[PDB]
Design a protein around this ligand. Structure first.
Ligand SMILES: Nc1ncnc2c1ncn2[C@@H]1O[C@H](COP(=O)(O)OP(=O)(O)NP(=O)(O)O)[C@@H](O)[C@H]1O
Ligand SMILES: Nc1ncnc2c1ncn2[C@@H]1O[C@H](COP(=O)(O)OP(=O)(O)NP(=O)(O)O)[C@@H](O)[C@H]1O
Ligand SMILES: [Mg+2]
Ligand SMILES: [Mg+2]
Lengths: 468, 482, 483
């Protein structure tokens, strides 16, 4: 049991002195016992003279110079395994749901090396998501990272939950949701909603692990939580072999936290006031989300854009790692289209002949082409009346309106809020379904047959029930 | 001695660097020879850095300093209602000692994830624009933000005034106790505020916590957390407190003073890396507690002053993202006579409908819409426009005018909904734009003499049935014709 | 404990270790810590040395022993690295075992002086219609690939490497071009995937990968391009030719900035140190074409820079432009329209390559440089009059714009290129629609191969257009177009 003594407390920075070379490695978790419970520090630097500088994971009010400090012998560790599913967990792996100890048998460090260059899967590949818009038009990369855009009131939470659900049923992979700087009020919402939707099931089996680093916690805590959430996600890949979803809400709050820790550590700020380690801080998180030979952790990360300036060093660094974006728009929502994904805005590196095959690409590029003139044609149809359209134009526009509505879809999780049955359309259907519509094989169907239905057979089934 | 005492090594700029005090707690309070107090923010090997609560002309090198053994606490309890206190809870209003239920610390763990419930009960501000378009619920943190002199205090203040409607009742679950934090303001400004509350008989349910412009930086820094704990007594005991932090711009300035003078590292705009943590620590304490935990709530109106409307500044950024929405005020609108000068298209309450009386939600549904469509077609307001656009323009002008309101005159919900209804539904179209004010006044009094039944139902039921709606429709046209 | 050969750690933080002893150490000597992690003696001071780490700070504690190495920062070099993937210090990362080194070169090697150089005159064939015709690169040149995120920068360099398969299978050693690709700051998976592409096109056997990826320590990223140039230099100094892609320098500069600020060097413009120019300039000066006496070798550099919001005037862009011998600028606007390669010709230039261009291309590139980037005069104005004269250049312009398009992974031989351009410049496309210029090109090359292969062969073997071949080429062109 290796002991030290607090020698300094300056806000969330705490210095501790030790005995000769009994010094904790940088990134070790240290512990002080407080009457609150216990305070964790993470070793940041070796200052010299057997003194190390640390970052606090909780408040430091009340500390006294000379107080004992215990070395854990390693980095912050977190429980891993199925006993984390359906539970709420903080940055230091403690349960914060008043539901008792995470009776997990193993624990792993949050700091760890990425899969080796040799361990790296060598061919990019689609993660089929069960969602038309995404699969067809902006498919997710397996072991990739995806930027989720647009703030609130666009069904982000239902969209995330549908993903947790589609992945677990279609690929039997679990999810980990990391609220990085999560607003306590909103975490409490999410938890209640997850129970209501089924994805957490306290009396049964849960599909998702919740890890929260709330806004009222010190930067140290907010910077590390992502890695907490990620470690749990890695265990499902490395030991259970699954294709795993990792949600990070919000990735910008990870950056800002490290900006703040860096500032407390005395480091001279870089451009725009971000930490000089902005890119490596980002790399140390991202490079761990990838496809090994065992599985993949794939991550859906919510991205805030400061000043709506996309060249700002935070998005700019983030974007470097993003394989796709899903752009949720109120403008798509206010036309009653659910999920409110924007088909023109949402983009993927993998919408590519080589990755998805020549079919998939061709179908999607036409859909894209179609919707594109229809967008510019919103301008003349608003002035010239409808009739003023040319032969191929008045058709594709009648058929665009038809595509634009076929991009809707009922979510199995929305079911409880809606009563409409939910549909997980396989990518296979999604491709043909859209190819056929584009070829004119369904022009003689009224638009409403296309709204809130799964695969083509439901456009068929629906239109026959509208008939009487 | 040295475990319990210290020698002043150096003093200057409200920083006392102190030798000894080897057993002191971080953030613990100290006492000096001359009697000036301070708190120990920097614990270092050689020394302790103490920030002073009073003029440092009172401190000298060599001077003796004692521990008090206490982290900053503050008295809390109902006995503070009607009182005006400094940041440590000393009475400053000449009304005698303050009776305390007990004492809470300045810094308190915000309620966790689990002991909460979704925001649902409204904080009725009395302000048509807010209650109709940017509704606030008990537990929520809603930011009042804008450039100087745009009406920010006024929004907070009409809100506090409006709580007379329940704070004179007997049903503790409906009452809303009020805490107002004056950070960095001038004393005569706090004095005049007090007088206003006194005149409208709102002091009885309010507590003023004042750390004004001449007061040492620590006290301005502390005042919010300290007021927060005062608020929390209500929350922890099955009641509902509203806390206004007027304002957080000035509190961030105070903390920056301390940090720069303690030589902690500076960052953007010279703020310390823990200025986000200061405000989030502070603001997560507003909360809507679970049924197990008593259903208490604390609702926060932090104020932020922007400079040139730049919400990307360091402190507004921090606070915009911590909170649940923005009420955005603007000089432009203000000068046009739109008061409160709320910019609808920039204001939001992420909570939204869940916190609105159902009646107001019923009539306002479309208000959100017409006004949205209004400010889109605005540049058209300057001859040739189809009857579609002429209409859109007619409507919006009037709905805008309906949202003007005098200061110190908050409206009951049952007074708000019929006014909003008339507009929303086109009963104001044929009425020249200058007469919308006198219309509101006359129409209200007419409903009060002739239709007290409709108003009583709106108030007592909170929803509008198709019978209420139909009744409302008739009574309106009735008046508009007349 | 010898304090001459050995040291004790005083402190470690911010990527620096402060070390006591090592009295015999040289400035910039590599050192070894207990954990096996390596470092570089950066600043020797009375009573201590400051060592920059090539790994995480976790891997070094206070009180630990540090061993001298004897060696200034260096790397393995030689033809034995071919087919191999290594880290910035030369360590294999490809699962394949110890590197087979002809010897070791320092990371920092001085540039060839004023004397040992000769003007570039030998083509680096990219196989990209737009680059070979309009921004010809010569062996020994430095040409910047610059543009925003996701604009095809890497594609342009990678097609160039894939294209070398043409000569690196022959015997004639002078026509061959070995390839060093440097990944600095990229995702491990990007690079893994890149290497698999290279393997699949059988390009890997003549290329070397040097990777310092996103999660690695800033100094490893700072260093990679330098150790990659010495690897590249071996070919140069031994009468052979090497192409080096620095993908990308923007990220190298960022890493360097990380190191300088933690070293507490004063932030300048955009927070970069004063020496961020010297960072690139010394690196890139090492590209060269050597004299007869120095064996005639060459190292050609293709550094990649990433603009933000398309601004080529930022500090780092202009620094590199003031070093290299030209730029290939890629516009995000063209890229989104489907014009790929999205080479903005107005803003692209090769300062020395014209000499080294294959004559055939030079001959059918008559003014194409001037004309095209000037059709841009009319084009921008077009959308005030339905003119007569300037309606022609709008139709030719549009055609050459499609001719310049090109699919990825499909680099094309010179003799496959010159006909397409001849057929464009002389207006044989004027009548054909836009949507068919794509199909025209594939079908036209088939026709040429089967029926007029004698002529392609002549273009390939002499590289010129004799009046007769010029006239014969006119013949075959007119025929196909008519049908
Ligand atoms: N609804 C209203 N109608 C008319 N006048 C108003 C209204 N609200 C506020 N005012 C006046 O406008 C001025 C600014 O309001 P105030 O509440 O002081 O804003 P503020 O943003 O706190 N300004 P300051 O704190 O001084 O930067 C005061 O003189 C108010 O009396
Ligand atoms: N000539 C081409 N024709 C068609 N598609 C292309 C071409 N070149 C590149 N692409 C595609 O366009 C995307 C961007 O190309 P890439 O070469 O990755 O550019 P980059 O500037 O290096 N992007 P990054 O480095 O990730 O910011 C890739 O998905 C390519 O597959
Ligand atoms: Mg004010
Ligand atoms: Mg690239």
């Amino acid at each position: 049991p290796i002991t030290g003594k607090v020698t300094a407390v300056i806000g969330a920075i705490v210095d501790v002195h030790f005995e000769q070379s009994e010094l904790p490695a940088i990134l070790n978790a240290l512990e002080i016992k407080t009457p609150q419970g216990k305070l964790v520090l993470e070793v940041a630097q070796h200052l010299g003279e057997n003194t190390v500088r640390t970052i606090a994971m909780d408040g430091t009010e009340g500390l006294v110079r000379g107080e004992k400090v215990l070395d854990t012998g390693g980095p912050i560790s977190v429980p891993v395994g199925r006993e984390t599913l359906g539970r709420i967990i903080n940055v230091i792996g403690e349960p914060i749901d008043e539901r008792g100890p995470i009776k997990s048998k193993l624990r792993k460090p949050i700091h760890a090396d990425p899969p080796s260059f040799a361990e790296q899967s060598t061919s990019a590949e689609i993660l089929e998501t069960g969602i038309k818009v995404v699969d067809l038009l902006a498919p997710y990369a397996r072991g990739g990272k995806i930027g989720l855009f647009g703030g609130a009131g666009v069904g982000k939470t239902v969209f995330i939950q549908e993903l947790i659900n589609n992945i677990a049923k279609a690929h039997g992979g679990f999810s980990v949701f990391t609220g990085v700087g999560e607003r306590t009020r909103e975490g409490n919402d999410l938890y209640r909603e997850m129970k209501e939707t089924g994805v957490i099931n306290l009396e049964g089996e849960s599909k998702v692990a919740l890890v929260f680093g709330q806004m009222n916690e010190p930067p140290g805590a907010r910077a590390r939580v992502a890695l907490t959430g990620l470690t749990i996600a890695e265990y499902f890949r490395d030991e259970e072999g699954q294709d795993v979803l990792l949600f990070i809400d919000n990735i910008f709050r990870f950056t800002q936290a490290g900006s703040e820790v860096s500032a407390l550590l005395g480091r001279i700020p870089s451009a725009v006031g971000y930490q000089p380690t902005l890119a490596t801080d980002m790399g140390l998180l991202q490079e761990r989300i990838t496809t090994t030979k065992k599985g993949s952790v794939t991550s859906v990360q919510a991205v805030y854009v400061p000043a709506d300036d996309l060249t700002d060093p935070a998005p700019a660094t983030t974007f470097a790692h993003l394989d796709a974006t899903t752009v949720l728009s109120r403008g798509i929502s206010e036309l009653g289209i659910y999920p409110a994904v924007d088909p023109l805005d949402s983009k993927s590196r993998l919408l590519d002949a080589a990755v998805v095959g020549q079919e998939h690409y061709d179908v999607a590029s036409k859909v894209q082409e179609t919707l594109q003139t229809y967008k510019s044609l919103q301008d003349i149809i608003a002035i010239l009346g409808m009739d003023e359209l040319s032969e191929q134009d008045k058709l594709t526009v009648e058929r665009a309106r038809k595509i634009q509505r076929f991009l809707s879809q009922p979510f199995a999780v929305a079911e409880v809020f809606t009563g409409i049955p939910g549909k997980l359309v396989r990518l296979k259907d999604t491709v043909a379904s859209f190819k056929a519509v584009l070829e004119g094989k369904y022009d003689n169907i009224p638009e409403h047959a296309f709204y809130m239905v799964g695969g083509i057979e439901d456009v068929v089934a629906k239109a026959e029930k509208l008939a009487a | 001695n040295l475990n319990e005492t210290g020698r002043v090594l150096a003093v200057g700029d409200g920083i006392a660097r102190v030798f000894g005090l080897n057993n002191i707690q971080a953030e613990e309070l100290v006492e000096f020879s001359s009697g000036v107090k301070g708190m120990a923010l920097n614990l270092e090997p050689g020394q302790v850095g103490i920030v002073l609560f009073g003029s440092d002309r009172l401190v000298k090198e060599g001077e003796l300093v004692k521990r008090t053994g206490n982290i900053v606490d503050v008295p809390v309890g109902p006995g503070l209602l009607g009182r005006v206190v400094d940041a440590l809870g000393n009475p400053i209003d000449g009304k005698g000692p303050i009776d305390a239920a007990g004492r809470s610390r300045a810094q308190v763990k915000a309620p966790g994830i689990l002991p909460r419930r979704s925001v649902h009960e409204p904080v009725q501000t009395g302000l048509k624009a807010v209650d109709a378009l940017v509704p606030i619920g008990r537990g929520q943190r809603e930011l009042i933000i804008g450039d100087r002199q745009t009406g920010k205090t006024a929004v907070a203040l009409d809100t506090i005034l409006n709580q007379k409607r329940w704070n004179n009742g007997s049903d503790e679950s409906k009452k809303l106790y009020c805490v107002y934090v004056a950070v960095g303001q001038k004393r005569s400004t706090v004095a005049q505020l007090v007088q206003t509350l006194e005149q409208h008989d709102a002091m009885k349910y309010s507590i003023i916590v004042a750390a004004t412009a001449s007061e040492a930086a620590p006290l301005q820094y502390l005042a919010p957390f300290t007021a927060a704990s005062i608020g929390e007594w209500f929350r922890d005991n099955g009641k509902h407190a509203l806390i206004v932090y007027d304002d957080l711009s000035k509190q961030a300035v105070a903390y920056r003073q301390l940090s720069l003078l303690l030589r902690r590292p500076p960052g953007r705009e010279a703020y310390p890396g823990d200025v986000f943590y200061l405000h989030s620590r502070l603001l997560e304490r507003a909360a809507k507690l679970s049924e197990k935990e008593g259903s208490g709530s604390l609702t926060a109106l932090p104020v932020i002053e922007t400079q040139g409307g730049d919400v990307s500044a360091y402190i507004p950024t921090n606070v915009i993202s911590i909170t649940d929405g923005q009420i955005f005020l603007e000089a432009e609108l203000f000068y046009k006579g739109i008061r409160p000068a709320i910019n609808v298209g920039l204001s939001v309450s992420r909570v939204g409908s869940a916190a609105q009386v159902k009646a107001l939600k019923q009539v306002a549904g479309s208000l959100k819409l017409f006004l949205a469509q209004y400010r889109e077609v605005a540049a058209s307001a300057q001859s040739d426009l189809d009857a579609s656009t002429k209409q859109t323009l007619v409507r919006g002008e009037r709905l805008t005018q309906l949202l003007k309101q005098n200061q110190y005159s908050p409206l009951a919900t049952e007074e708000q909904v019929p006014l909003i209804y008339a507009g929303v539904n086109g009963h104001l179209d044929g009425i020249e734009l200058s007469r919308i004010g006198e219309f509101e006044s006359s129409f209200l009094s007419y409903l009060k003499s002739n239709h007290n039944e409709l108003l009583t139902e709106i108030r007592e039921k909170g929803e509008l049935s198709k019978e209420l709606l139909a009744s409302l429709k008739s009574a309106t046209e009735s008046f508009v014709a007349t």
